[PDB]
Design goal:
Chain B: This is DNA-directed RNA polymerase subunit beta. This is part of a larger assembly, with 1 copy of chain A, 2 copies of chain B and 1 copy of chain C. Chain B has strands at 2-9, 24-30, 40-42, 48-50. By secondary structure, chain B is an all-beta fold. Chain B has a two-stranded antiparallel sheet. Chain B has a two-stranded antiparallel sheet with strand order 3-4. In chain B, strand 3 and strand 4 form a beta hairpin. Chain C has helices at residues 56-61, 66-83; strands at 3-9, 14-19, 28-30, 36-39. Chain C has a 4-stranded antiparallel β-sheet, with no helix packed on it. The chains are: A mainly alpha, B mainly beta, C alpha+beta. The interface between A and C is medium-sized, with 17 and 14 residues. Chain A binds one DNA strand through helix 4, helix 6, helix 7 and helix 13.
DNA sequence: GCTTGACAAAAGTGTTAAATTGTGCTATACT
């Protein structure tokens, strides 16, 4: 019927461990890693080992991995008991659990049986950190680096504390002072904290229309402009006719009317085979010719 | 219409605007709406209807005083419907 | 102006990626397949980051000295021998 | 059911009920906070996070 | 109608110093 129900029915099958069992599995795991590394190093160093012993070490690995899997499957309950507290914060319960299990896996990889501390003591750190670190990396549709998620929560903490002391929402100055940062920074920070809204929401009454329907596509073509723009190209064509054959081409290349990419004086002078200063001189005269009332009066309307 | 008032909320002037907002101004425009053909009139008895036309006061059914009538209402209330 | 470069994916699929004639041609290209592809002609100079991802062995070596591990392995082996 | 069985919440009353949700869930936060927090090292200000209260109204 | 050398601004390019960003970690016990 329900999935989260199923996961619990299976982890509940595994038998919890006592302090003594944890160390034994811990030992078997470390023996499994060293045994596996020893076999790999001996081939690198051109060394051999007793046949029977070498085959014994290989089995140490099979027993080591069973220890690793067994250790995890026992403390899965601990992951859930920690994952309950972070529900409703923008992350599905299961996702919290799985991320907790990821943290749990690392704890097993770094746990130390020689310290004599109960396993749950050191695993809670990693499992806890694994979940929190996950939320900062996944809870927001627009991701924010953990350090920024870190400061945002710190600011909200100061805000909530300052809110409780003063009896009024602390201003950017009060909030910046207590946090030892510029008021403009807290403002820039307060902009980052905002989360997006759903276009598929229904702002119209009784589902008359979703919110997305009211969004303009400002990039869409404007029919009247595409026609005026087309008439402007045609009108410039005539204006180009009044200029010199070479003089018209210089204006085209200088602004890129023909190929759509402008050209510097040198490049323009390179196609006409003259100095880059000569092109500068020619262009200036074209503009003067273009500013003449006869040639220029027609194009003012196009602003 | 005409512009009545303007409310300017700046940032230099401390004020208090949502994060990022520098200046906030609102303009209030008023309009004097003459009763125009198409508007919806109605009495207190549920009778309602639009303004189909507005005749000059000259060509309007007027009493012997020369006192023109203001509005001409057809007999909406069919029998049984009443609207007494 | 268009340069036509072909990359080869690990699974065996090939892709054509048009580039500009003037610009440099990369040696590896993120392809439609979703995998990295090496170009066929032009030499690769592929400077692999060569960052070895941290493994469980690295986390164990930094707490157990090889001697402590050797002693543990003897305990385990002396234990398996006894079981026989 | 019957017509007379209608109660009719007044403005002040249905406002109070919304406060109940704010206070009750505020106590649900203080219960969790006091266990993890060190004893005598916490005060009403540290245990009380009125966010669900103000956000409720 | 064109070019020269000056000069400048503007555009790049290589070399460095912040800053930004991602990952690892925290050992009473806690299932």
């Amino acid at each position: 019927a329900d999935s989260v129900r199923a996961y619990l029915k299976q982890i509940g099958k595994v038998a919890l461990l006592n302090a003594e069992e944890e160390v034994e599995l811990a030992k078997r795991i470390e023996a499994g890693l060293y045994a596996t590394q020893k076999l790999a190093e001996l081939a690198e160093k051109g060394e051999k080992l007793p046949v029977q012993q070498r085959r014994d070490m290989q089995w140490i690995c099979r027993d080591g991995d069973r220890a690793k899997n067994h250790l995890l499957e026992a403390n899965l309950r601990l992951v859930v008991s920690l994952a309950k507290r972070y529900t409703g914060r923008g992350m599905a319960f299961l996702d919290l659990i799985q991320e907790g299990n990821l943290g749990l896996i690392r704890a097993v990889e770094k746990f130390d049986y020689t310290k004599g501390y109960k396993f749950s003591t050191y695993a809670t750190w990693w499992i806890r950190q694994a979940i929190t670190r996950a939320m900062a990396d996944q809870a927001r549709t627009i991701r924010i680096p953990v350090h920024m998620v870190e400061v945002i929560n710190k600011l909200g903490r100061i805000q909530r504390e300052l809110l409780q002391d003063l009896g009024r929402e602390p201003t950017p100055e009060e909030l910046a002072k207590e946090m030892d940062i510029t008021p403009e920074k807290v403002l820039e920070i307060q902009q980052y904290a905002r989360e997006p809204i759903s276009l598929d929401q229904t702002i119209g009454d009784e589902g008359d229309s979703q919110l997305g329907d009211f969004i303009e596509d400002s990039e869409a073509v404007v029919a009247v402009d595409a026609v005026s723009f087309t008439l402007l190209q045609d009108q410039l064509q005539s204006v180009l006719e009044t200029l010199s054959e070479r003089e018209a081409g210089v204006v085209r290349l200088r602004f890129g009317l023909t190929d759509g990419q402008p050209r510097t004086l040198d490049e323009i002078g390179q196609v006409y085979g003259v100095t880059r200063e000569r092109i500068r001189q020619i262009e200036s005269k074209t503009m003067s010719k273009l500013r003449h009332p006869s040639r220029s009066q027609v194009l003012r309307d196009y602003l | 219409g005409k512009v009545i008032g303007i409310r300017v909320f700046s940032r230099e002037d401390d004020d208090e605007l949502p994060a990022g907002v520098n200046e906030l101004v609102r303009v209030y425009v008023a309009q004097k709406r003459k009763i125009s053909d198409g508007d919806k009139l109605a009495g207190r008895h549920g009778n309602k209807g639009v303004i189909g036309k507005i005749l000059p006061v000259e060509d309007m059914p007027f009493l012997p005083d020369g006192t023109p009538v203001d509005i001409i209402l057809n007999t909406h209330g069919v029998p049984r419907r009443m609207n007494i | 102006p268009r340069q036509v470069a072909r990359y080869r994916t690990d699974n065996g699929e090939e892709f054509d990626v048009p580039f500009a004639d003037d610009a440099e041609i990369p040696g590896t290209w993120l392809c439609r397949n979703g995998l990295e592809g090496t170009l066929i002609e032009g030499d690769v100079p592929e400077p692999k980051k060569v960052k070895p991802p941290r493994t469980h062995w690295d986390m164990l070596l930094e707490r157990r000295s090889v001697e402590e591990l050797e002693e543990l392995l003897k305990e385990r082996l002396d234990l398996i021998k006894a079981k026989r | 059911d019957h017509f007379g069985n209608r109660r009719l919440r007044t403005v002040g009353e249905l406002i109070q009920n919304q406060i109940r949700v704010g206070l009750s869930r505020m106590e649900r936060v203080v219960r969790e906070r006091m266990t993890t927090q060190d004893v005598e090292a916490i005060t009403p200000q540290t245990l009380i996070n009125i966010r669900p209260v103000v956000a409720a109204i």
